[PDB]
Design an enzyme around this catalytic site. Structure first.
Site, PDB file in Angstrom:
ATOM      1  N   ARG A 160      -8.703   4.012 -13.402  1.00 31.61           N
ATOM      2  CA  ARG A 160      -9.238   4.621 -12.179  1.00 31.61           C
ATOM      3  C   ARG A 160      -9.107   6.147 -12.087  1.00 31.61           C
ATOM      4  O   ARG A 160      -8.374   6.661 -11.236  1.00 31.61           O
ATOM      5  CB  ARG A 160      -8.611   3.968 -10.954  1.00 31.61           C
TER       6      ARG A 160
ATOM      7  N   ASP B 101      -5.606   7.716  -3.611  1.00 32.46           N
ATOM      8  CA  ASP B 101      -6.664   6.795  -3.204  1.00 32.46           C
ATOM      9  C   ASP B 101      -7.520   7.451  -2.146  1.00 32.46           C
ATOM     10  O   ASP B 101      -6.997   8.009  -1.195  1.00 32.46           O
ATOM     11  CB  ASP B 101      -6.076   5.503  -2.636  1.00 32.46           C
TER      12      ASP B 101
ATOM     13  N   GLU C 104       1.696   1.492  -6.327  1.00 39.37           N
ATOM     14  CA  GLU C 104       0.369   1.699  -5.797  1.00 39.37           C
ATOM     15  C   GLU C 104      -0.232   2.950  -6.434  1.00 39.37           C
ATOM     16  O   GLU C 104       0.266   3.435  -7.447  1.00 39.37           O
ATOM     17  CB  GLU C 104       0.369   1.764  -4.274  1.00 39.37           C
TER      18      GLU C 104
ATOM     19  N   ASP D 280       0.892   4.141  -1.351  1.00 37.23           N
ATOM     20  CA  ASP D 280       0.219   5.208  -2.091  1.00 37.23           C
ATOM     21  C   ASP D 280       0.979   6.512  -1.996  1.00 37.23           C
ATOM     22  O   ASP D 280       1.640   6.770  -0.992  1.00 37.23           O
ATOM     23  CB  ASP D 280      -1.169   5.452  -1.516  1.00 37.23           C
TER      24      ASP D 280
ATOM     25  N   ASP E 127       0.786  -1.229   0.000  1.00 35.59           N
ATOM     26  CA  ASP E 127       0.000   0.000   0.000  1.00 35.59           C
ATOM     27  C   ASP E 127       0.817   1.278   0.000  1.00 35.59           C
ATOM     28  O   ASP E 127       0.496   2.213   0.722  1.00 35.59           O
ATOM     29  CB  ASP E 127      -0.979   0.003   1.181  1.00 35.59           C
TER      30      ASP E 127
HETATM   31 CA   LIG Z   1      -3.780   2.201  -1.933  1.00 33.22          CA
END
Ligand SMILES: [Ca+2]
Length: 352
Positions: free
Chosen positions: A218, A170, A166, A131, A129
């Site tokens: 996304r 988000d 990542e 990010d 993760d």
């Molecule tokens: Ca993430």
């Protein structure tokens, strides 16, 4: 002012009694925020003791350049990031011109956070993760004028064959109001979630004046709620753009799409398709698809593409005040306003 041109309304750390601090490294940002929780007697104050305006002057170009030369060695490394957890006094993290970071900013259960002028890229720990920016359970967050980048590529043998890197931004949980504006997002496979699962639906988010280039998907992967996307320049999308799911509603206006595959769609669930209100974009009818290199593909599961380029639903009245320029003006001018070192300049009709 608390005007962001979107759902988030926050001045961040730029309020009465703000304490200005200079961070020269990641660790400095960490220690600064930690000190900001203490009162005049040294006791911790829930939510923070005073507002902060942290000017980050660090530079991690060496780390960035080294990672860019060996992108497949990044995913397995420890993720690097500064966590802004349960800090509600108001905080602004602004990079100085010339600053750069090879670490992310992770916002959790906080509010009134502004992240500006930060150049973040090639973060390690995609499998854990890593990010660049994460907004979790945090309303009134403004992510503006940053440059978020990596390589729009997936190395072999990564966990889930989706963890080379990542996400750029988000958003999940109760991050009820967020504005993502004037960012130069490039070379990112997974740009950003708007809901972490089928159950994590909601939020009102605004994506405006962003410049996307060489991104796979996304923009965002939306789950329920509302998304207002205006004045963004979408170029070289290799997977799909706005994926409106779980009955989400999107208002897509005055954007410029070009060399994009599935720019507006609702796929991967096979049900509960989201809707979109299209207006003022450079694409006005299916005939424009060839003019701007727009391609469409099917999915193995039931889906809905905007291949007829017609509005499939409605959208509530946009709460805030905003004034979009024409899609042509974004195509012409936006690259000079989006990103770092633009002195946080905004594109107005006057400049068109
Ligand atoms: Ca993430």
């Amino acid at each position: 002012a608390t005007d962001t041109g979107g759902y988030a309304a926050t001045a961040g750390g730029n309020v009465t009694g703000a304490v200005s601090k200079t961070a020269t490294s990641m660790q400095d940002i960490v220690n600064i925020i930690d000190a900001a929780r203490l009162d005049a007697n040294g006791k911790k104050v829930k939510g923070g003791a005073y507002p902060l305006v942290i000017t980050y002057t660090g530079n991690e170009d060496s780390l960035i350049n080294a990672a860019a030369a060996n992108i497949c060695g990044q995913w397995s490394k420890d993720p690097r990031g500064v966590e802004i957890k349960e800090f509600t006094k108001g905080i602004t993290i602004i990079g100085a011109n010339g600053s750069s970071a090879n670490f992310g900013i992770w916002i959790k259960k906080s509010s009134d956070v502004v992240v500006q002028n930060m150049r973040i890229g090639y973060l390690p720990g995609g499998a854990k993760d890593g990010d660049m920016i994460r907004v979790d359970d945090s309303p009134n967050v403004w992510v503006d004028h940053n440059e978020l980048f990596a390589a729009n590529h997936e190395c072999d043998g990564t966990p889930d064959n989706d963890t080379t890197f990542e996400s750029a931004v988000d958003i999940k949980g109760a991050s009820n109001t967020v504005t993502v504006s004037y960012n130069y997002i490039h070379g990112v496979k997974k740009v950003g979630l708007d809901g972490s699962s089928s159950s994590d639906t909601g939020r009102n988010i605004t994506y405006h004046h962003n410049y996307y280039n060489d991104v796979n998907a996304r923009l965002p992967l939306q789950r329920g709620g509302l998304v207002h996307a205006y004045n963004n320049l979408y170029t070289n999308i290799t997977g799909s753009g706005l994926n409106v799911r779980q009955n989400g509603q999107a208002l897509i206006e005055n954007n410029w799409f070009e060399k994009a595959i599935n720019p507006v769609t609702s796929r991967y669930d096979g049900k509960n398709f989201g809707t979109w209100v299209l207006k003022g974009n450079n694409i006005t009818k299916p005939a424009d698809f060839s003019t701007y290199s727009i391609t469409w593909t099917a999915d193995t599961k039931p889906y809905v593409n905007a291949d007829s380029w017609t509005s499939t639903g409605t959208f509530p009245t946009v709460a805030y005040n905003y004034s979009p320029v024409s899609a042509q003006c974004v195509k012409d001018k936006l690259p000079g306003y989006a990103g770092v070192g633009k002195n946080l300049a905004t594109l107005t009709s006057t400049a068109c």
